[PDB]
Amino acid sequence: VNSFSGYLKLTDNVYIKNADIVEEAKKVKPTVVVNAANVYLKHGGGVAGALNKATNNAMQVESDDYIATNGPLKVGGSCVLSGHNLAKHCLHVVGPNVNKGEDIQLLKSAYENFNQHEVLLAPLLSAGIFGADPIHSLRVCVDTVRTNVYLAVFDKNLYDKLVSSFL
Ligand SMILES: O=C(O)C[C@@H]1CN(c2ncnc3[nH]c4cc(F)ccc4c23)C[C@H](CO)O1
């Protein structure tokens, strides 16, 4: 039993809710919240900008030190950093950005990072400003992630479409 509430169950291990991931993280305090990161960990907008704003920019300060030490992430890659006031940990995962011409096949690699964590609160990777089709992202998620993932979908209209079209 865990503390996630109001989710629709899609599969054995994937759950979905119309929710603001920031508000969900603050209420749940999950062990892991996933950020929709870019390779530079520049958290300017979308999910990343919202999450970073909720940390009062502490996420960005920590991220800048990470990049100065380690250099950029790979598209499809990830790193574990602090969850600040939102979660114990933040798993920063880089899905391909269609608006930069990155290969959508890397979306599966991105979701594979979730399998290193038993339970996660996450957005749909490569959705929103990353330009991928969220219906496709959900399909890849269900077909790749084996651990327990709680998906927060900000847009109610999109949430209803994801549920109604789910095979
Ligand atoms: O679909 C859309 O219209 C945009 C969404 C945005 N993003 C989010 N996901 C879940 N929680 C979110 N809280 C936010 C607060 C913000 F200020 C900006 C974005 C989010 C956000 C990912 C999905 C992928 O499908 O796309």
mmCIF file of C-alpha atoms and ligand atoms in Angstrom:
data_model
loop_
_atom_site.group_PDB
_atom_site.id
_atom_site.type_symbol
_atom_site.label_atom_id
_atom_site.label_comp_id
_atom_site.label_asym_id
_atom_site.label_seq_id
_atom_site.Cartn_x
_atom_site.Cartn_y
_atom_site.Cartn_z
ATOM 1 C CA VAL A 1 0.000 0.000 0.000
ATOM 2 C CA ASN A 2 1.210 3.540 -0.836
ATOM 3 C CA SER A 3 -0.148 7.068 -0.397
ATOM 4 C CA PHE A 4 -1.080 7.872 -4.029
ATOM 5 C CA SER A 5 -4.818 8.681 -4.243
ATOM 6 C CA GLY A 6 -7.412 9.058 -7.008
ATOM 7 C CA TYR A 7 -5.418 7.277 -9.738
ATOM 8 C CA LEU A 8 -6.952 5.219 -12.513
ATOM 9 C CA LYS A 9 -5.230 1.871 -12.923
ATOM 10 C CA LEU A 10 -4.115 1.224 -16.535
ATOM 11 C CA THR A 11 -2.050 -1.953 -16.059
ATOM 12 C CA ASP A 12 -0.509 -4.083 -13.327
ATOM 13 C CA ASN A 13 2.070 -1.339 -12.675
ATOM 14 C CA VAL A 14 0.959 1.914 -14.394
ATOM 15 C CA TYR A 15 -1.510 4.394 -12.882
ATOM 16 C CA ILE A 16 -2.708 7.776 -14.212
ATOM 17 C CA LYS A 17 -4.310 10.930 -12.767
ATOM 18 C CA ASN A 18 -5.258 14.421 -13.933
ATOM 19 C CA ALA A 19 -3.032 16.377 -11.563
ATOM 20 C CA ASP A 20 -0.399 19.069 -11.291
ATOM 21 C CA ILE A 21 2.800 17.119 -10.596
ATOM 22 C CA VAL A 22 4.060 19.944 -8.356
ATOM 23 C CA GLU A 23 0.967 19.798 -6.153
ATOM 24 C CA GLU A 24 1.004 16.006 -6.181
ATOM 25 C CA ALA A 25 4.659 15.887 -5.114
ATOM 26 C CA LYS A 26 4.112 18.405 -2.309
ATOM 27 C CA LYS A 27 1.218 16.347 -0.949
ATOM 28 C CA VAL A 28 2.579 12.915 -1.445
ATOM 29 C CA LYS A 29 6.358 13.555 -0.795
ATOM 30 C CA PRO A 30 7.133 10.575 -2.983
ATOM 31 C CA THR A 31 10.485 8.853 -2.768
ATOM 32 C CA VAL A 32 11.072 9.780 -6.440
ATOM 33 C CA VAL A 33 9.615 12.536 -8.615
ATOM 34 C CA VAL A 34 10.650 12.485 -12.280
ATOM 35 C CA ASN A 35 11.622 15.717 -14.013
ATOM 36 C CA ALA A 36 11.242 16.200 -17.775
ATOM 37 C CA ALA A 37 14.818 17.440 -18.071
ATOM 38 C CA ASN A 38 17.051 18.548 -20.928
ATOM 39 C CA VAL A 39 20.714 17.560 -21.257
ATOM 40 C CA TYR A 40 21.895 20.855 -19.712
ATOM 41 C CA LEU A 41 19.503 20.613 -16.737
ATOM 42 C CA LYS A 42 18.271 24.099 -17.595
ATOM 43 C CA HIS A 43 14.846 24.036 -15.949
ATOM 44 C CA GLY A 44 13.238 26.889 -17.817
ATOM 45 C CA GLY A 45 9.724 25.791 -18.653
ATOM 46 C CA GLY A 46 7.271 22.965 -18.897
ATOM 47 C CA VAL A 47 7.380 20.452 -16.067
ATOM 48 C CA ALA A 48 11.005 21.323 -15.290
ATOM 49 C CA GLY A 49 10.358 25.038 -14.948
ATOM 50 C CA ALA A 50 7.372 24.339 -12.703
ATOM 51 C CA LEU A 51 9.250 21.905 -10.511
ATOM 52 C CA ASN A 52 12.231 24.232 -10.227
ATOM 53 C CA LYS A 53 10.017 27.232 -9.369
ATOM 54 C CA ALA A 54 8.405 25.182 -6.593
ATOM 55 C CA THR A 55 11.908 24.621 -5.100
ATOM 56 C CA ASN A 56 12.597 28.388 -5.102
ATOM 57 C CA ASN A 57 15.374 27.743 -7.698
ATOM 58 C CA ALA A 58 17.268 25.312 -5.428
ATOM 59 C CA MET A 59 16.861 22.614 -8.094
ATOM 60 C CA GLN A 60 18.583 24.874 -10.650
ATOM 61 C CA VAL A 61 21.446 25.744 -8.276
ATOM 62 C CA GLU A 62 22.076 22.050 -7.568
ATOM 63 C CA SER A 63 21.778 21.228 -11.280
ATOM 64 C CA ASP A 64 24.311 23.875 -12.307
ATOM 65 C CA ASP A 65 26.861 22.355 -9.929
ATOM 66 C CA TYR A 66 26.082 18.873 -11.322
ATOM 67 C CA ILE A 67 26.701 20.036 -14.908
ATOM 68 C CA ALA A 68 29.858 21.942 -13.995
ATOM 69 C CA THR A 69 31.269 18.707 -12.527
ATOM 70 C CA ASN A 70 29.905 16.073 -14.920
ATOM 71 C CA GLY A 71 28.953 17.780 -18.180
ATOM 72 C CA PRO A 72 25.638 17.296 -19.986
ATOM 73 C CA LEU A 73 23.439 14.242 -19.808
ATOM 74 C CA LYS A 74 22.731 12.057 -22.844
ATOM 75 C CA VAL A 75 19.369 12.182 -24.589
ATOM 76 C CA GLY A 76 17.700 9.084 -23.144
ATOM 77 C CA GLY A 77 19.778 9.362 -19.959
ATOM 78 C CA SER A 78 19.172 10.466 -16.398
ATOM 79 C CA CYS A 79 20.676 11.491 -13.095
ATOM 80 C CA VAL A 80 19.442 11.324 -9.500
ATOM 81 C CA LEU A 81 19.555 14.593 -7.562
ATOM 82 C CA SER A 82 17.762 15.938 -4.505
ATOM 83 C CA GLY A 83 13.987 16.189 -4.470
ATOM 84 C CA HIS A 84 14.243 19.337 -2.333
ATOM 85 C CA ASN A 85 10.827 20.152 -0.803
ATOM 86 C CA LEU A 86 8.984 17.983 -3.359
ATOM 87 C CA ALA A 87 10.302 14.423 -2.893
ATOM 88 C CA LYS A 88 13.232 12.562 -1.408
ATOM 89 C CA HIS A 89 14.899 12.362 -4.835
ATOM 90 C CA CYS A 90 14.380 13.852 -8.267
ATOM 91 C CA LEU A 91 15.150 11.590 -11.220
ATOM 92 C CA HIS A 92 16.001 13.995 -14.058
ATOM 93 C CA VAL A 93 15.222 12.094 -17.276
ATOM 94 C CA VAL A 94 15.945 13.421 -20.777
ATOM 95 C CA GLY A 95 13.391 12.351 -23.344
ATOM 96 C CA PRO A 96 13.998 13.264 -26.983
ATOM 97 C CA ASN A 97 12.816 16.737 -27.957
ATOM 98 C CA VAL A 98 11.021 16.522 -31.307
ATOM 99 C CA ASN A 99 11.359 20.329 -31.670
ATOM 100 C CA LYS A 100 15.175 19.765 -31.757
ATOM 101 C CA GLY A 101 14.934 16.835 -34.236
ATOM 102 C CA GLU A 102 15.931 14.112 -31.740
ATOM 103 C CA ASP A 103 15.154 10.502 -32.451
ATOM 104 C CA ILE A 104 11.834 9.379 -30.942
ATOM 105 C CA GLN A 105 13.252 5.834 -30.536
ATOM 106 C CA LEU A 106 15.230 7.316 -27.635
ATOM 107 C CA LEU A 107 11.951 7.624 -25.724
ATOM 108 C CA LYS A 108 12.151 3.932 -24.805
ATOM 109 C CA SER A 109 15.697 4.407 -23.472
ATOM 110 C CA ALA A 110 14.453 7.379 -21.432
ATOM 111 C CA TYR A 111 11.682 5.326 -19.807
ATOM 112 C CA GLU A 112 14.119 2.488 -19.011
ATOM 113 C CA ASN A 113 15.624 4.770 -16.351
ATOM 114 C CA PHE A 114 12.382 4.402 -14.369
ATOM 115 C CA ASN A 115 13.113 0.675 -13.843
ATOM 116 C CA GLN A 116 15.903 1.563 -11.403
ATOM 117 C CA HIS A 117 13.261 2.840 -8.917
ATOM 118 C CA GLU A 118 10.533 0.754 -7.308
ATOM 119 C CA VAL A 119 7.922 3.566 -7.244
ATOM 120 C CA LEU A 120 7.861 6.935 -9.062
ATOM 121 C CA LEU A 121 5.651 9.963 -9.625
ATOM 122 C CA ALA A 122 6.218 11.046 -13.212
ATOM 123 C CA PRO A 123 5.059 13.086 -16.177
ATOM 124 C CA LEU A 124 4.738 11.620 -19.635
ATOM 125 C CA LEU A 125 8.221 11.876 -21.114
ATOM 126 C CA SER A 126 8.673 13.955 -24.265
ATOM 127 C CA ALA A 127 5.106 15.320 -23.948
ATOM 128 C CA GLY A 128 4.216 18.991 -23.634
ATOM 129 C CA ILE A 129 6.898 21.346 -24.926
ATOM 130 C CA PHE A 130 9.087 18.373 -25.924
ATOM 131 C CA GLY A 131 6.739 17.897 -28.874
ATOM 132 C CA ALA A 132 5.982 14.172 -28.888
ATOM 133 C CA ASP A 133 2.511 12.650 -29.095
ATOM 134 C CA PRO A 134 1.449 11.969 -25.471
ATOM 135 C CA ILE A 135 -0.605 8.936 -26.558
ATOM 136 C CA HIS A 136 2.605 7.438 -27.942
ATOM 137 C CA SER A 137 4.512 8.369 -24.796
ATOM 138 C CA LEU A 138 1.954 6.544 -22.641
ATOM 139 C CA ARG A 139 2.218 3.463 -24.872
ATOM 140 C CA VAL A 140 6.017 3.417 -24.564
ATOM 141 C CA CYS A 141 5.719 3.908 -20.804
ATOM 142 C CA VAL A 142 3.371 0.951 -20.371
ATOM 143 C CA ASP A 143 5.499 -1.154 -22.665
ATOM 144 C CA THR A 144 8.851 -0.282 -21.008
ATOM 145 C CA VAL A 145 8.408 0.517 -17.316
ATOM 146 C CA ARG A 146 8.042 -2.516 -15.061
ATOM 147 C CA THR A 147 8.213 -0.713 -11.710
ATOM 148 C CA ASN A 148 5.268 1.158 -10.199
ATOM 149 C CA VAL A 149 4.691 4.474 -11.971
ATOM 150 C CA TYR A 150 2.105 7.114 -11.060
ATOM 151 C CA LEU A 151 1.554 9.414 -14.052
ATOM 152 C CA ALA A 152 0.427 13.004 -13.472
ATOM 153 C CA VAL A 153 -1.172 14.666 -16.508
ATOM 154 C CA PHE A 154 -1.692 18.407 -16.042
ATOM 155 C CA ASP A 155 -4.219 18.978 -18.836
ATOM 156 C CA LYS A 156 -7.686 17.584 -18.104
ATOM 157 C CA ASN A 157 -8.597 17.446 -21.795
ATOM 158 C CA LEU A 158 -5.445 15.449 -22.523
ATOM 159 C CA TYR A 159 -5.991 13.157 -19.533
ATOM 160 C CA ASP A 160 -9.477 12.231 -20.756
ATOM 161 C CA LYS A 161 -8.105 11.560 -24.245
ATOM 162 C CA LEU A 162 -5.309 9.358 -22.864
ATOM 163 C CA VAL A 163 -7.750 7.267 -20.829
ATOM 164 C CA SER A 164 -10.400 7.003 -23.541
ATOM 165 C CA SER A 165 -7.892 5.903 -26.202
ATOM 166 C CA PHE A 166 -5.860 3.512 -24.041
ATOM 167 C CA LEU A 167 -5.619 -0.020 -25.388
HETATM 168 O O1 LIG B 1 -0.049 18.548 -22.304
HETATM 169 C C1 LIG B 1 0.133 19.767 -22.037
HETATM 170 O O2 LIG B 1 -0.692 20.631 -22.436
HETATM 171 C C2 LIG B 1 1.358 20.200 -21.231
HETATM 172 C C3 LIG B 1 1.862 19.095 -20.304
HETATM 173 C C4 LIG B 1 2.910 19.638 -19.331
HETATM 174 N N1 LIG B 1 3.675 18.662 -18.590
HETATM 175 C C5 LIG B 1 3.169 18.475 -17.233
HETATM 176 N N2 LIG B 1 2.788 17.268 -16.842
HETATM 177 C C6 LIG B 1 2.311 17.055 -15.627
HETATM 178 N N3 LIG B 1 2.207 18.036 -14.759
HETATM 179 C C7 LIG B 1 2.576 19.282 -15.066
HETATM 180 N N4 LIG B 1 2.549 20.405 -14.345
HETATM 181 C C8 LIG B 1 3.024 21.425 -15.069
HETATM 182 C C9 LIG B 1 3.188 22.773 -14.756
HETATM 183 C C10 LIG B 1 3.707 23.647 -15.695
HETATM 184 F F1 LIG B 1 3.865 24.967 -15.388
HETATM 185 C C11 LIG B 1 4.062 23.170 -16.951
HETATM 186 C C12 LIG B 1 3.896 21.831 -17.274
HETATM 187 C C13 LIG B 1 3.371 20.951 -16.319
HETATM 188 C C14 LIG B 1 3.080 19.551 -16.323
HETATM 189 C C15 LIG B 1 3.947 17.435 -19.306
HETATM 190 C C16 LIG B 1 2.818 16.984 -20.241
HETATM 191 C C17 LIG B 1 3.299 15.814 -21.102
HETATM 192 O O3 LIG B 1 2.206 15.286 -21.809
HETATM 193 O O4 LIG B 1 2.382 18.029 -21.097
#
